Amino acid sequence: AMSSEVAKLVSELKDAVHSHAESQKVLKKVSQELQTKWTDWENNRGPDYLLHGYRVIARALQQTYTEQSMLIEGTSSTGPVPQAVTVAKDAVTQTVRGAIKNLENPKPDPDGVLMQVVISLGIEGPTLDPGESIQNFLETRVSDFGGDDSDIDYTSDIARLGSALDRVRENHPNEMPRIWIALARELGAAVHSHATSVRIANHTRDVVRMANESSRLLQGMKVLSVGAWANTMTVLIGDLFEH
Amino acid sequence: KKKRLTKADIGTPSNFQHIGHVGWDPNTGFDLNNLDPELKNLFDMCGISEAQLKDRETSKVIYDFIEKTGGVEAVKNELRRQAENLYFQGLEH
């Protein structure tokens, strides 16, 4: 770095490489904390883990609600509600009532892969690059949650949602937050109902202050790496809604 | 069947593309394509350069002030009040 002009090249790249691998060290420590805790809490505290997992999700649905609330254009209906958004809002209610149904009123056997996926959509979807395909996201997630082996066919539900949500995402981008809030309020009710019915089967109530811990560590991850957070979110989701 | 992402995969990078909190990344600064419009508008009224937004040391100090004064929400509400004030003040009696 003798010259004035190579020393800057050296310095800038020096810095770029170091503070990258520095921020990786951080993330790794936060990850390892979150890992040992959840591993223990699963293997020890049994259904209190589960109970807190719902609340960590439940908290994350409310967060995307209020976050996406502040992107909506006008709460006023300024012209006709476009076709693509009516169709999107309806698909939200249908896919969610049906993820509710695969789980609560099945046909011989309860399955929760559909719940899991739309939950990941609800928390992680609003954080995706606008360029990301909602259809593709949903397809990738039925594999990541099992799905291919499972004897329910989801291809109907996925194409309902992916088609509707992607049409808005490309054709009416400023209306997407309207759909995300809808998705979150239905999911938020759906989850809180699953949480209260799983409470009925003998439990330590206020030690699910785990929730404030995980949502502390997860909030730290999020500002370091939104992507890493979305991955560890979908890990939590994968331990939920099963049996 | 097995879920591809288990507890040992916690913190591993997502194979998907993500916007980033308040449209800010702690190594690359503010993603300028996915910056919020009303936040951009604030930054232009402050003369803040695109190169200052994309610089790590300075974007942190912007990010942190924005969090200090009540998150992006307060900023949005403020530019919005200012616009409906500018609406009524364009009216000539």
Author numbering:
A (entry chain D): 70 to 177, 180 to 272, 277 to 318
B (entry chain A): 67 to 159
Passage from the reporting paper:
To enter epithelial cells, the obligate intracellular pathogen Chlamydia pneumoniae secretes early effector proteins, which bind to and modulate the host-cell’s plasma membrane and recruit several pivotal endocytic host proteins. The early secreted Cpn effector protein SemD binds to the inner leaflet of the PM below the invading EB and directly recruits G-actin and the essential endocytic proteins SNX9 and N-WASP12. During a Cpn infection, the C-terminus of the membrane-bound SemD interacts with the BR-GBD domain of N-WASP, thus triggering N-WASP activation and Arp2/3-mediated actin polymerisation via an unknown mechanism. We demonstrate that SemD, a protein of 382 aa, can interact simultaneously with the PM, SNX9 and N-WASP, thereby combining membrane association and deformation with modulation of the actin polymerisation machinery.
To understand the activation of N-WASP by SemD, we structurally analysed the complex formed by recombinant SemDΔAPH and the BR-GBD domain of N-WASP. The co-crystal of SemDΔAPH in complex with BR-GBD yielded a structure with a medium resolution of 3.3 Å, which is attributable to the flexible termini of both proteins. Interestingly, the loop connecting helices 2 and 3 (208-GTSSTG−213) of SemDΔAPH is stabilised in the complex and can now be modelled. Despite the moderate resolution of the crystals containing the SemDΔAPH – BR-GBD complex, the interaction surface between the two proteins is well resolved. Comparison of the structures of SemDΔAPH alone and in complex with BR-GBD revealed virtually identical conformations of the SemD core regions, as indicated by a low RMSD of 0.7 Å. We found three positively charged residues within the BR domain of N-WASP (K193, R194 and K197) that interact directly with the negatively charged area found on the front of SemD, formed by helices α1, α2, α5 and α9. Additionally, five residues of the N-WASP CRIB domain engage with residues in the SemD binding groove, mainly formed by helix α4, the adjacent loop and helix α9. The N-WASP C-sub domain is located underneath the helical arrangement of SemDΔAPH, flanked by its extended helix α1. Owing to the flexibility of the N-terminal domains of SemDΔAPH and BR-GBD, these regions are not resolved in the crystal structure of the complex. Our structural and biochemical data further reveal that SemD provides the negatively charged patch and the binding groove required for selective binding of the positively charged C-terminal part of the BR and the CRIB domains of N-WASP, respectively, thus mimicking Cdc42GTP-mediated N-WASP activation.
